[PDB]
Amino acid sequence: IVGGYTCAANSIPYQVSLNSGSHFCGGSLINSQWVVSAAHCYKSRIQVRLGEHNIDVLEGNEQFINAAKIITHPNFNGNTLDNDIMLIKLSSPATLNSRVATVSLPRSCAAAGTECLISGWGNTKSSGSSYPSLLQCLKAPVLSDSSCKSSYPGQITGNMICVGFLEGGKDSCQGDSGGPVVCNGQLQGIVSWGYGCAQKNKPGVYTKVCNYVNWIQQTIAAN
Ligand SMILES: NC(=[NH2+])NCCCO
Ligand SMILES: [Ca+2]
């Protein structure tokens, strides 16, 4: 997260870290047994780390649970990034408490201008690299579906939204991938793609979660 602030510890209780020797992507806990993330985050072996704030120190609220199943969207396209969504089944249920909690899926799509919270352990520098120990947070609005489409001509499908700031300096980045965009208590976005990060007129593009609730529920019920 570039241009963000350090979240209060455990204040984003649905945020997970996907780990494969180190942190590599975010995700969101949506059921005691299921995390949703981005298909471009796929790895065949993943440990889900719940209840984190400092990913470099055991602080006592962590639950480390291996992925039992990893299911990418059958229509994920690695070129266009359409359908950039993935589900991970935990090998045991997360134990839900104040620090490890589910986030609601969308009841509807979010209006343009809706304020959202984007979070993750991704790069924090707009130039160079600094990867944080502590979870970072960013408040950002859903952008006009036009301001999104003008930024990336011909590249925004109906399964993508832009959330962010056209002036730059405030965006998700590498390592935030797969993490949450939560607006009015609902998971509306998954960190997906962009052109670098925090550049002027290149806002973050996010998988539009309100199109996937049936896919999510059907996959959960079948697996
Ligand atoms: N604005 C961004 N490039 N964010 C997405 C990072 C790549 O998943
Ligand atoms: Ca920790």
Swiss-Prot record:
The record marks D171 as: Required for specificity. Binds 1 Ca(2+) ion per subunit. GO terms for biological process: digestion; proteolysis. SUPFAM superfamilies: Trypsin-like serine proteases. Disulfide bonds join C7-C137, C25-C41, C109-C210, C116-C183, C148-C162, C173-C197. Keywords: Calcium, Digestion, Disulfide bond, Hydrolase, Metal-binding, Protease, Secreted, Serine protease, Zymogen. InterPro entries: Peptidase_S1_PA, Peptidase_S1_PA_chymotrypsin, Peptidase_S1A, Serine_Proteases_S1, Trypsin_dom, TRYPSIN_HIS, TRYPSIN_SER. It is found in: Secreted, Extracellular space. One of its GO terms (cellular component) is extracellular space. Pfam families: Trypsin. One of its GO terms (molecular function) is serine-type endopeptidase activity. Its main location: secreted. Residues 1-221 form the Peptidase S1 domain. Its EC number is 3.4.21.4. Its cofactor is Ca(2+). The active site is at H40, D84, S177. It is an enzyme of class 3 (hydrolase). Ca(2+) binds at E52, N54, V57, E62. It catalyses: Preferential cleavage: Arg-|-Xaa, Lys-|-Xaa. PANTHER family: RIKEN CDNA 2210010C04 GENE (PTHR24264:SF15), TRYPSIN-RELATED (PTHR24264). Belongs to the peptidase S1 family. This is Trypsin. The lineage of its organism: Eukaryota, Metazoa, Chordata, Craniata, Vertebrata.
